[PDB]
């Protein structure tokens, strides 16, 4: 399984799909670095995630995203949290 | 969490982390994209994942992993798993 393969060191010379460091979005480890200070940053985030936006990382937009609010918010924690 | 980033489809257009891209082997979806449907597919990959190879996807070999037979197998099925 996906654990075992973290846990036995494979994916230190492989990734689960191609494409990595191309991606249009940006890192979810600047993402928290960025807003570490904020206080409403899930809320922010959970916005964002659900409704979409452009401009903060690049011209290229996040398109509204199928996720619940509550969904939303989880994310958004779960991101904060990655350092 | 990051299980659900991955189910929700995120991971399409974002990295958990800089510096992607740079992994010296196959990703995993290339693999069972490869191999999928090939009567021998478990025990091909089982037999590399335990014993090692080089020389099918580059010049770069994959050592011997530390991994037994059984784990070897369930590791191969995971992968051959991934669309
Ligand atoms: C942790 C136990 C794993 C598992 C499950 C896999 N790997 Fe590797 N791997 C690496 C390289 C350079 C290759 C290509 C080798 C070649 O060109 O022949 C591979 C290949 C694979 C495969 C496909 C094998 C095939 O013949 O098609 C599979 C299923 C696979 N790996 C699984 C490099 C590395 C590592 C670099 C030091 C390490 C660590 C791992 N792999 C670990 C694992
Ligand atoms: C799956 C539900 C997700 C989640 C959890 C996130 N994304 Fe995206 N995203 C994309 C692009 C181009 C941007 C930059 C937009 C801009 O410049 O403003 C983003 C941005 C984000 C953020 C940061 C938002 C902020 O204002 O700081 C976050 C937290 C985030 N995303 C989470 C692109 C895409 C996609 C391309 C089609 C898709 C799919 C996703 N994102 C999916 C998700």
Redesign the pocket.
């Given at each position: 399984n996906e654990q075992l393969?973290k846990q036995?060191?494979?994916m230190?010379?492989?990734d689960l799909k191609a494409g990595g460091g191309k991606k249009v979005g940006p890192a979810y480890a600047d993402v928290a670095k960025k807003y570490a200070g904020r206080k409403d940053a899930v809320d922010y985030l959970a916005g964002k995630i659900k409704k979409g936006g452009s401009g903060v990382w690049g011209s290229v937009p996040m398109p509204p995203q199928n996720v619940t609010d509550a969904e939303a918010k989880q994310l958004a924690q779960w991101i904060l949290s990655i350092k």
């Open positions: 393969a036995k060191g494979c230190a010379c492989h």
